[PDB]
Amino acid sequence: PVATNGERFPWQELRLPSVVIPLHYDLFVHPNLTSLDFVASEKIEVLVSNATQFIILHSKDLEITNATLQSEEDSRYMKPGKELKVLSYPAHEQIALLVPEKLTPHLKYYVAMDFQAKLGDGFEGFYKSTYRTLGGETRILAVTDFEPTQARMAFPCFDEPLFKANFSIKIRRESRHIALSNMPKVKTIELEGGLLEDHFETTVKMSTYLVAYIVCDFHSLSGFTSSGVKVSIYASPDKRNQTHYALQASLKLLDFYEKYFDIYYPLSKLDLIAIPDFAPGAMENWGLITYRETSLLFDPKTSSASDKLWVTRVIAHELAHQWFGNLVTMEWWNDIWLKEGFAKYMELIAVNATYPELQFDDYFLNVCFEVITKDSLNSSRPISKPAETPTQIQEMFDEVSYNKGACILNMLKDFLGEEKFQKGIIQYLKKFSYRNAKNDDLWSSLSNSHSDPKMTSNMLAFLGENAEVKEMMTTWTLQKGIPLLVVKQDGCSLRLQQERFLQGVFQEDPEWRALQERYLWHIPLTYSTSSSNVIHRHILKSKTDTLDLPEKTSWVKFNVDSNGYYIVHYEGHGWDQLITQLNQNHTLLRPKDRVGLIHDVFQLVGAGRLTLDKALDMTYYLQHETSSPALLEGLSYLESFYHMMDRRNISDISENLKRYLLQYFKPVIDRQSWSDKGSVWDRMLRSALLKLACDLNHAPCIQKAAELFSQWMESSGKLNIPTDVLKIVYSVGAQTTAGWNYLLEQYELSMSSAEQNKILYALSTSKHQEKLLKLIELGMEGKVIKTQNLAALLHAIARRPKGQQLAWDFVRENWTHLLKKFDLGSYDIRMIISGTTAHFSSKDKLQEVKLFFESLEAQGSHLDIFQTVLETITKNIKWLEKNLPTLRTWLMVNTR
Template sequence: MEQLNPHRLPRNVKPLHYNIHIKPDLANFVFEGEESIQLNVLEATSKIVLNAADLKINYAMLDCGNSKELLRVSYDKDMETASFEGEDSELELKPGMTPMLYLSFNGELNDNMRGFYRTSYKIDGQKRWGAVTQLESCDARRAFPCFDEPDFKATFRIALTMPENFTAFSNMEPRSITNAGYGLKKVLFEITPKMSTYLVAFVVAELDCIANRDCNGVLIRVWTRPGKQSHGQFALECALHTLPYFANIYGIPYPLQKLDMVSLPDLAAGAMENWGLITYRETALLVDPQNPSASSKEGVASVVDHELAHQWFGNYVTMVWWTHLWLNEGFASYVGDRAVSNQFPKWQALERYVAEVHLDALREDGLKNTHPIEVEVKNPKEINEIFDSISYNKGASVNRMLHHYLGKDFDKGVALYLRRHAYGNAVSDDLWQALEDCSGKPVKDVMSGFTRRSGYPVLMVENLGNENGKTRLRISQKQFMYLPENTSEQDARWNIPFEILTPRGTSRHYLDKESHEINVEAEGDDWIKLNPGHAGFYRVAYPESMLKKLSECVKQKKFSAIDRMCILDDAFALVQAGEIETSSVLEMLLVYRQETNYNVWLIIGNVLGTLDNLLKERNQEDILKRLYVTAQLLIDSRVKLLGWKKSRSDTHTDVLLRGFILSMAGKYGDSDTIKNASRRFQKFINGEKLDPDLRQAVYSIVALNGDSDTLSALREIHRKSDSHEEKTRVLIAMGNFRDVDAVKTILDFSLSDELRKQDFPILFSAMGTNHCARKMVWQFIKSNWDEVRSRYHGVYFMLVDILEPMGGFATKEMLADVEEFFKKNRLEGLERTMDKIVEKIKINIAWAEREKL
């Protein structure tokens, strides 16, 4: 068989089953392992090659049934492989043989948050240590030697030996627990289903749990630090709803007997979907029942349901290779939000999905330095870089578009796809085939353009006139890009099913060429809206006359919240791309003065924030003052209506909107709001209560207007709090400081032991979006680059949040500085991120120069 690239393993041997016994030593931060792998020889070979990194293999022997042979091992550090050959004679492995490979090895329990690593927590004020795995995408090889590619599926039996007072977890339930002597115990787990190495998991820690069984009898447990069990109740309720929800939709029961959800103090990602043993950051799993906030409940529900979706999308059926990562992440993102909406219909979760997922994907995919959903990746560093907005958010958006196109046949086709590839691997074409078989529609013809090419179209509308109650439109398409000079030379045509909404109703159409003329039921004075509900993954550009009619409809709330937000976002994107003037969007903003929907306000806030940053970057004080007047006109009535106190009639989204509006009022200089926030903060630090739903707004406002004393008070809250949610609020608020001395102190704090490694990006993301701190942050990153890079070696995706805010610069001076630094400090696995940042600065400069700023 042909080897695809040097980073891929040969296909001459594959694993059938692993027996793995791990013994962590938490006193010395090392571990030992013993392993046997049953192999299936597919082609004649004299050598066995598998993955191993940061491990020392001490013993290797091959048992072929009628002979046993000691093996010598050689390592390729760059390829992260170990090769085994006969020590005394050449191996003669022939097709059909099923030998057993025996290995012993050891490694370090590092603090890099990948492989098998250590994590710390406190019990009764005392620091304790545990050990946990994080193996996606290519880090199983750091926990045990293995065939570390997703299509090398096998079964696993895990055993762990640890101190008697610790609890051990793995993908399956324990089969036996035996005394191992010297105060140790050995836990042997049941055999897993056939699965990929990156989904293997084991945890050793001192934890407590709450548990219940879902309606299908599956045992679900939420594990927390001792004393925090009640904080897992909300996540447990989400899982009790969602696990049966997915089993019912797809007609495929959850295949394991149990599901453990474990909260951990140190985790690189927000959560990891290990089959039967999902690991989470504490903020992604725990809600304080005494101080619950609407945002924390919503965040937990979203992450829990995303990870539960993976139990089918990614675990039950896995992509063949990381090129098709979107089959995991795009599905989990979309159907996870559907599950949230099903359990909490008043939360407007699908509106939030459009605001935070769909529109984010459109913004990122309008860049030159984007990538197709199906992107060819070769080495592990490239793989980590595609865990991004395109794989997650564009993948989810394509699924929503497809669902809208197919209707009920979408879930039927997905269920067929899952059944056909159960416990196996798949590619995008397998999904298209199942959906075509159920719907009879040309799914592949429509969807391939959106998954195999980067970018997306903008549909340009031209009104050709009205006659006999029908309006004739010319609909044209071209690739949307923020910088016109970046327009691709590729054939900029997509096959696009689209809808048109008028006062007379909705009509469906199909565009498969550059332009097309159609008639719609509409009088001359009627408004006409393309892409109602914004299910299609494209933008729409209207002539000024049509856009004004739509704006009037927005003012009168004739459109859904999704349409109100997307009309504004499309128009603003066209401003940034130079297609329409900035003044037209500023005028459009005023029609949103009576807007009451939280999700629409997220888009209004993004527009105002982006304009605010550009004007500050270009030192346009006079225009900035006018922007603040506009912002205050928009915000003032909302502040007066919502106030600071909750009402019994408040909905979930009212609570979220109150905090958001108050934060904006403070940001844009409302003196009453600033005074009120300061007064509430002083009362809180003096021992009075502060509503958890208002804390982020209060902390951020006082930081924005605060000094070193304010910072000291916030740091004390961070130090004393036992809640990671509260610590995160403080870190986000720290990003708002404008006081130079406070910013310097925060930068020094960032590399101290007070801040967990996983939280460094949270702080720097917040600081980087603050114009007043951004240059200082950038200088700090440059001065401390070696330390920052070494801290996140192997998990460079965590550096994305640190670097991306630098895309807010908007001067040629800073463009040259950033370009020069990135040129000298290229990092494999961060190249695309670096190029995107440079491109975003260029977009800002081009925009400012067009507007003569």
């Protein structure tokens, strides 16, 4: 069970022993940004709760040269020796420290090692990044990213989030660099040869994955929150101007969170820094949050309204973590939604509260619809499941841990109301401050809202409704997928019935009965009727139940405003009824009810519970619809049918769609200005509508956009393009070897990585194979087009008909190289796989992908995303074979 030199490596489990608890780490790191390596040492104060001959902790890719143990309490180890024998077992990323004399329960010891490695080459542990300056200089910084399991690549440590400790960090550096870390800098002291050495205030108790340090030459803007925290935004010096909005938003959010959670942020400073090469979107390292440049930086001339909205989100997301994750931390990675689900959910409360004009409230339903796909497949997973190897732990970061977790919290908040929800939250955070919780600690704390309360008879429903709350959500976390609520209206008697919603699996399928087996949700229902817009609430705990309506009514609309994580079906006239209402007077349904009805109709076609012609019937009212969320939801289905047709050659149906979209909706498309004027939905509407018109080669749209591009190129950036149409204008621009060349050159020179983002997109809507592969080759290189951007580039290329095949060929014929740059469980490889295959909709393509996935399990590689893809290409094939002629005739009928 053992190896390396020989010898029995004394520990066997992948998890660490719990006999040696860490308490304080003295960490000294000395990096050199010229030799691109580092030297380092640590002293770890541990407490032993059991007698042991050995200590076990993590360490990967680090060379260890000293190993001593000390104690002020165990004379045998009194200063300075002894020396420990060090035993390495890479397969478990562990090392063993072999103590000469079995240690003593309840006494403290001091472990000490010296370690060194090259600066990392990826996006892991202590790695190298580079940026360009305004003068075309290329500089180097060194930066940490640890989540989940890579602190162990920087320093040996008890590397599991339970082993919270205090950290005391010192860093050696040249005068041209600063050094940053979790905590403020107490001391710089100067040294012999002229080097400096920063001391940082000891951390509070905290998990290893959040420890951070950076050595760079960046610049900042600072400001102070209402409660005295110094917020600073760091970016490379030529981008200082782009940090203003981040400074403004962090202050108001950190304010908001202190008041909302009723718990001060504990450190004196909060730094946000924008790292040029950064794989995740951001990481919530306590006191030193790192960001993708596009998550943090903003610049009014090239960053759109959508951009701002994204930057605010990510900032609100990371600050939320300072309490959810850093303050209170998962016991282990199985319950990782405990922090990502909550940070995600809190983007909504905090951004709604601090920036209501961003209208983020209306964008939150998209987070939940986006996860209802995926979750309507059998390859889904529950929100908490066991996970033990590092890849599986990385795999826990997906739309389920984040989106779905945030969505069911929203459900529960709507049930208990905001006050009891906030109160529950505050108690969760206050109670596990500086330690760890699991699922059940949350549910207990969310249910519970001389003596504290007054005694009553009504008290029994306060102790029993509380127990209901806990019983409820354990079904939402331990069960994969989402419930279909099927309503039958006949009389003033409504029959209720829950199934597991399945897509590409119809009510009468040979595989349907098994997949439906043991599933049952405590679904907190809501609804309203045509009579009174008054919400009623009932809790369907059983596979069957019924309700009497206090009147007769035209229609019943379940799932008010879509606060609930379920789809609704109406048997009988229900669908005919509600659609009629939408056709005649649509404003007698609340806007979010509309968004939901549109959503659910199209989702139910997929499930075979409804014919496509009935969905397509509902979209007719969109000619009258001015609520942008519902109008854009609606359009999005028509726009995806088109691209799906376009992706096959099915050009008779595609051309009909193009005509129905430009004809119907011709008025709304035509009110659109090529400007940045109006509200945020106003501008979300404008970019959408114009993008659609130039995708469908509308002659006005293509000509306006093409003009702006010449005006722009022939002034070499002088006259300027309103942000909301920037991406359109550039991509129409890219349709010639001239524009595309110019744009590629503008990419290298630009200093808005949000502009770069729009340019590289535009560049991928070209039709020449040569251009698309060039984009990819560059992407591999990592010089022109950074490798952090490759996965999204392949995705953009594959999305479009001319690039479908190329992206596929490339992913297969270059798989080995792809993996040298990213971990198998990285969001990069997940997206590279998925983005190049999941839109495929034919028996042929399904075959090839089945083969390419098989081969990857010849070699040592398994991911869930394999089944999920195949289940999505299958879902697609059925959709076409079971709905396509209905779409063909509904258009033809319509042309008539």
